[model samples]
Target chain A: GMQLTSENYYSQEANKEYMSVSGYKDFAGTYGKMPCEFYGMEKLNGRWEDEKSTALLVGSYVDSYFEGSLDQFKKDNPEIFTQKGELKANFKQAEEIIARIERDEYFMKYMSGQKQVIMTGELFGAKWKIKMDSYIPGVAIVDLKVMASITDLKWVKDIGYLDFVRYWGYDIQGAVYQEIVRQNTGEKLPFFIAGATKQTEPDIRIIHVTDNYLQEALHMVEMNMPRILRVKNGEVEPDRCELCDCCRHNRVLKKPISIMDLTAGI
Target chain B: GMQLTSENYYSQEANKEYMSVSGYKDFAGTYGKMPCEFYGMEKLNGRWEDEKSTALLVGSYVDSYFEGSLDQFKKDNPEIFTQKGELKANFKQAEEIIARIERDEYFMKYMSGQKQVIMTGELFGAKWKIKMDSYIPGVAIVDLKVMASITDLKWVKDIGYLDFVRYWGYDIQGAVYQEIVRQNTGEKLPFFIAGATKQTEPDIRIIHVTDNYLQEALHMVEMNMPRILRVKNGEVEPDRCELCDCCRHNRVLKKPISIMDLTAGI
Candidate 1:
């Protein structure tokens, strides 16, 4: 006879309906779960995407493949077709990505699965989230960044976008991203930046993230998420330095009295 | 004064426009990529999701917390805040999750990153994709699963869910996802299934996937990319069984001439 336990195992299993859209959509309430608009509080209040785009059509070109197609590698994800489509965006990236994907076996193999998925749960006292470009559940998290130069891949370790990734912080992004995945999943998935050049004949390079590679300036992507939570919920106002686009919107200083910007080098 | 190496580095970077949306978007033609539409010819000619739901709100409700809140974790990922948001989900799952989070400090700490991310790259010459519920770039992939009972967590090892996970293929999902990551990234980022019971006071269990466990069946998510490539591009059509969802869609079974189902079991 099959091992019969008193536990009512039949009802415990998740039914087929669980995979339904409503099944997933209903769960979109996002208690501590997170995403764009930065905060859920201001969602219906109004939505905003202040980040400015610097290019004409390069991004859209790449996104059509990676975010759209390469990302469609799953049962739930819907794949988008280019059809006998007309050309509009930057045709250069296509040329470059084509050469690279054909040549780079590593990345070729990597893009085999779905990409750009998010994970949400509680952590370190607050709710948190991580956006993984490419992930193999329980195996690894890979973040693919398209860059202008391979040199940019070598940041002060925690940086990129060349001066931007370094000054702006792809390294810090890498560090925190790596640690957060480690902390949450208990598996220290190695972080790597798959850098593909944009030359007429683009090049590909893979750099793995690590200790000296991703320091605190690299590792600490947050000043602890608590303060951000306070401001996000409108429990408190969003703080600004009067310099960033986010802060410049609310610049109250006519004399740069924002203090932080007033100090001079000795 | 910049250090000059004899290596030609001029063409080694991506163009600013290449980093632009259009750059990658232009690559959307999927020169070496593929997807599904049963016909294997036009995955996106008209993409669709036909998989039906199986359970009630319990799955999504748990996903709300574990995959949504608990997994809301990263620098690039800003967390969401609920300002007195009302609850309309399966309260039972919440009760169990809350209890588990409270009691399972390690899990509480672990669920601190993103979940539901995938990795896509060329592997075995076939473009592949792996789905991950929780990921840290290069660290590990963690799949967050909800179960009817924690009793199933003992299924083999550090696992969870129940006959549910095993029967429904969470364990199977975990393996293919892991192998896909390895083939693409060339590194194994230990996989784990964090299981929590669906009971009123759901039990918590975390299962760590190991080589001893992730056997061949645990592996082989892709079938030597070449065949898949041909099948995907329509160069070679998949042999249909006339029964499976894939086969049923390609039914030529109206003919007794191609008979394979004619012989009954002896």
Candidate 2:
């Protein structure tokens, strides 16, 4: 496998060789429900362009800003700029979100760590990689997450409701990152999510995703990794979600499904 | 003024002559915020097709089934049926939702009243109409609502957070329906939402919108009605939300907006 660096970290060759946290999240679903397996497969195989939607780019813009690569980020993602060279409305908010986090001294303290430190390790019989936004060796592994709202709760089936962190598998992300970091460096560190919202007046939080949640999330990920690995290795056929954009775009609509089946998990 | 009946209940004329809870909701925002003024105006003027998305049709399908107009509903909405006349997956879910409600004796009791009882009255100097799904002449106003989930909470701006009932202006609906029924019959009846979810296994509840909530909702609606009325009558130019379907469709994008403004309310 190729050595992952800041230069080749996001390269296709590195992505194809190792499973990242985002790759696992995409394939295994937020909590291993396998929501969009086909979409995940396409993304993992690099067949589908993981379109850098405005939301993703917005988060990346801020990440790049923090990583001291804002100039390159802006240059690479020209879609964030208009003909007048003005930042699009969402990127403008990204700037404010950065400002919101920067204004807070405590937040800065959490963010003031080794930025974008790439780490890789074997997790549950699969090679996994993690990029830490702010890594304080032996202290904490901080991931800066710019999300819709910090206070928003997401509905998860069977497990009732959860905050955005758990809903979007940020806990799982923390677990994966912490494990990989631990594997690389013998010292196990606590994972903190440096959270900022995309509100008109953004809310900032230094959220510690506790060891208890991380452990549970890790177990779930471990439980699902066999199937995930098999699917990734082309040993098993990827299941079609029939709901996600990839499935819908590639859908043939062979038969009319019962109306009951239509809103099954809705 | 024309007497309202089931036949002419959803007529353009009926809608034009009197404000309905949904119309008022669209005109004013969920809670007097006026999120999509242009969208509301376009809908009011019949300029835009209020696209009966699958979700809406699913709700309507169940409503029609319960109202004893399923035959007509099916005939009118051909899209709900496949080429072989099989119910679409969503409509099947709608059928299950109906069955889920039917299985409960207590829920049936709540539903067992005069169906589709149209009532008209004046509220905040505007003529308004309401049709109860189950109207117990002197006791209660029950409205059948098929929603995604009864347990889901929605984030409303300025206000902290609310359940789907308040988020989608079901509180306002209850208030409007109760008020109209009160005006018509001279007896104030408590409003109950006979809600059924579109879950894989549907959940049913006879949720009673409290008088306190209703009163506050009515007050908010009253506060916004004058402006809504003016906009509806074309006396005032409806403000373009710059976010909703109508505004987006008609948008010229004359200037590049700051990214901050893009997701302001979001």
Candidate 3:
């Protein structure tokens, strides 16, 4: 007696189309043609570098948690260990899980059927490519987020959801994927799974389409299209201030205005 | 006798430049001619709406801050209760301070002389009227911005300095303004300012620049120019789904997606 829900909506063809669109080549091509000057590629490059560094810092935090958790697991499950064998086994399981998500279509189909869709993709323009992690149907996307805390989960539900849309440009990515799904299989895709490794509870949350929300999403893409194109065409300028420290230092290769200069004599 | 320090050795003239250039309208024209199906006036209209919203938000934030500060001042300075005359006197003093900043030639000379140049004019592709905030004898042109906090200031530094250039369809607005000054005054303008108000200590900060910084800024503009043009021309699409909120809401008003749809299946 499964109750009918919007979660029942799934289309393999739509998934494939999304995957095809987000192919790396497509992303590179669209990204390449964009004028370097207008998108401030130099600035973007700098920002990317900073983001990478920040990501590393975040990784370190995750690694520390993992180490602690492993220690606790070893203490509680001595029967599962022989020297470092238990640790090796755990690592092996992690790798297997990753592989299943990446290459096993049955697993993916199962996930999609459960409305999980483990084989999530990154969007490049209107296309989609596989993300690092996703869930199979039935599991929450939250389970995949590695190092999230309960507080973080609450934050995600409260402020992070909208903030994520704002900062990461998710609206366009989602809408285009939905369109891809519709075009490929003539079935409307109704959900988006935001996978993160940090949550305290069920990490996976289901997002629904309302007429207003969908239209808003489409509108955002339409609105940002010109800006994206402008970046592609060299009409926009790069931001070189300290906010993009890495790009400023590595890509830009120049000194920045001092805080004093930023504050005085205007 | 003031001795120049190494700080003073820092050359003020950031390598800013001036040239004729097409602006947003030209960009829209070019975008209108692109091969993409999604590039159209509908998209442009959506973007205009978004920009308008952002501008409105900015205005509201500034107005609220001004009004709140005045209200607080009136309450805190109770001595003025006896003669409401004291309140007027204080307000007049504040106005005088603002007026002094506006009229002070020494400050203007220091600011405009630092780094100034024109970016768009008859020589460039622009068809609209161009204006500058102010001119100094030997410095760069100046533009004024007001913000409530350091974070807001930082945001302006990140987006405004760069985006203004893009919006103008040029490399550097301040530099371009400075060039206009140089052309008018027969003197090299070498500096610009980003004035900010922080909620924390040192409520006001001035960001200064030199010619080298301006050259770097121009280089950044050069790199992103193509992308900016592409965006203007609507050749590019939104990179992510969440980024499309405005577009989806406006154009595809029916079957709208819920905010939750960003993460869940409908």
Q: Residues A177-251, candidate 3, lDDT per residue (tens digit)?
A: 565445544565544432323221112222333435556766655555445445534576533334334433555
Q: After the best TM-score superposition of candidate 2, give how far the Cα of residue A91 lies from its true spot, in angstroms.
A: 1.9
Model 3 has fnat of: 0.21
- Candidate 1 regions exceeding 4 Å error are A1-47, A51-63, A67-91, A152-167, A179-185, A212-219, A246-266, B1-266
Question: DockQ, per-model, please?
Answer: 0.01, 0.02, 0.08
TM-score of chain A of each: 0.58, 0.93, 0.42
Query: Candidate 1: RMSD over Cα atoms?
Result: 31.5
In the range A55-75, model 2's lDDT, one tens digit per residue, is 789889999998899999888
Give the distance in Å from residue B107's predicted Cα in candidate 3 to where it truly belongs. Answer: 4.5
Ranking by TM-score: 2, 1, 3
User: Per-residue lDDT for B29-84 in model 2, tens only?
Assistant: 76435577888777767788766799888877877777789899988999988889
lDDT of 1 by residue, A70-181 (tens): 3333222222223465343345455456555545556655555456664443433444445566676665556665655543222243332233333434555566566666
lDDT by candidate, in order shown: 0.45, 0.80, 0.37
Candidate 1 TM-score versus the reference? 0.34
The DockQ-derived docking category for candidate 2 is: incorrect
Candidate no. 2 TM-score: 0.52
Q: How many residue pairs clash in each candidate?
A: 94, 13, 156
Error of 3 at A255 (Å): 56
